[PDB]
Ligand binder design. Structure first.
Ligand SMILES: COc1cc2nc(-c3cc(F)ccc3O)nc(N[C@@H]3CNC[C@H]3C(C)(C)O)c2cc1OC
Ligand SMILES: [Mg+2]
Ligand SMILES: [Mg+2]
Ligand code: NA
Length: 269
């Protein structure tokens, strides 16, 4: 049993591990029924893991929203970092997708309304996430209609971007990266909108809108194709088709902006 502030966990109770983090289930030390996830350094990638967990603290401690994973506490030291977060008992969207194969438009709508809500807060705070993908979207069953909650997680790559500035760090997951990102160009908040478009397309069809055999091939594809048009099934509703075409614009100046996304007809009741 290890303690972190008012919280504890055992390393027997593994939730999962990736290259840059290990997560365990724990609990509050007084209120044993308050469950938490405790994210810890992955010592196989020590320096990068430590950096990303520190960055995640700096961002998440400023965000309180039902659709963003809550940071209850954290502990940063010279050689260790812990985040104590709300436990998301539903697992991630990637695993849900693996079982469902595809989602109904009504489900896509429910999830995307919640994602949009989170993105409204990020945008108002001047934060870009930079690693939106199904593996970083968690599900939580907290009474009320459609109570399942989506939560954006894994803010290790996130940054503040001043509204008259552009980012240039190459980070993210190639399959979900906007063309401008993977082509090593300057980018802004609309790169995340491409990632979202990609997620929605994947929920709808079970596939990526532009498949390649590698990151290098995908880059070359974007470089050579000045116009990108994803294949949308004929059965797709008109509002969802329009949303996807507007999110999955190659050129960020032609891509849908935040205000249009937040008020898109697809997202209406
Ligand atoms: C109930 O089942 C699960 C709960 C999970 N909760 C969190 C989780 C992560 C947080 F950062 C905070 C709260 C949480 O609950 N994270 C999981 N997996 C993470 C997220 N997707 C990839 C994977 C990893 C470790 C590579 O990042 C869970 C996987 C689960 O099942 C496989
Ligand atoms: Mg991130
Ligand atoms: Mg951009
Ligand atoms: Na802030």
């Amino acid at each position: 049993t290890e303690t972190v502030g008012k919280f504890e966990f055992s390393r027997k109770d593994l939730i999962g591990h990736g290259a840059f983090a290990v997560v365990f289930k724990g609990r509050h030390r007084e209120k044993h029924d308050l469950e938490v996830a405790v994210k810890c350094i992955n010592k196989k990638n020590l320096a990068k893991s430590q950096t990303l967990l520190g960055k995640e603290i700096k961002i998440l401690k400023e965000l309180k929203h039902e659709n963003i994973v809550a940071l209850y506490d954290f502990q940063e030291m010279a050689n260790s970092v812990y985040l104590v977060m709300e436990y998301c008992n539903g697992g991630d969207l990637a695993d849900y997708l693996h079982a469902m194969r595809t989602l109904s438009e009504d489900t896509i709508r429910l999830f995307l309304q919640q994602i949009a809500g989170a993105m409204r807060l990020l945008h108002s705070k001047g934060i870009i996430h930079r690693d939106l993908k199904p593996q970083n979207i968690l599900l939580s069953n907290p009474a009320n209609p459609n109570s399942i909650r989506v939560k954006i997680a894994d803010f290790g790559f996130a940054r503040y971007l001043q509204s008259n500035m552009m980012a240039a760090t190459l980070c993210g997951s190639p399959m979900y990266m906007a063309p401008e990102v993977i082509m090593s160009q300057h980018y802004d908040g609309k790169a995340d909108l491409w990632s979202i478009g990609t997620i929605v397309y994947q929920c709808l069809t079970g596939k990526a809108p532009f498949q390649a055999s590698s990151p290098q091939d995908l880059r070359l594809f974007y470089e050579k194709n000045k116009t990108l048009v994803p294949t949308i099934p004929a059965a797709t509703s008109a509002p969802l088709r329009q949303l996807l075409l507007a999110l999955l614009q190659r050129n960020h100046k032609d891509r849908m902006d935040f205000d249009e996304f937040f008020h898109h007809p697809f997202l209406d009741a």
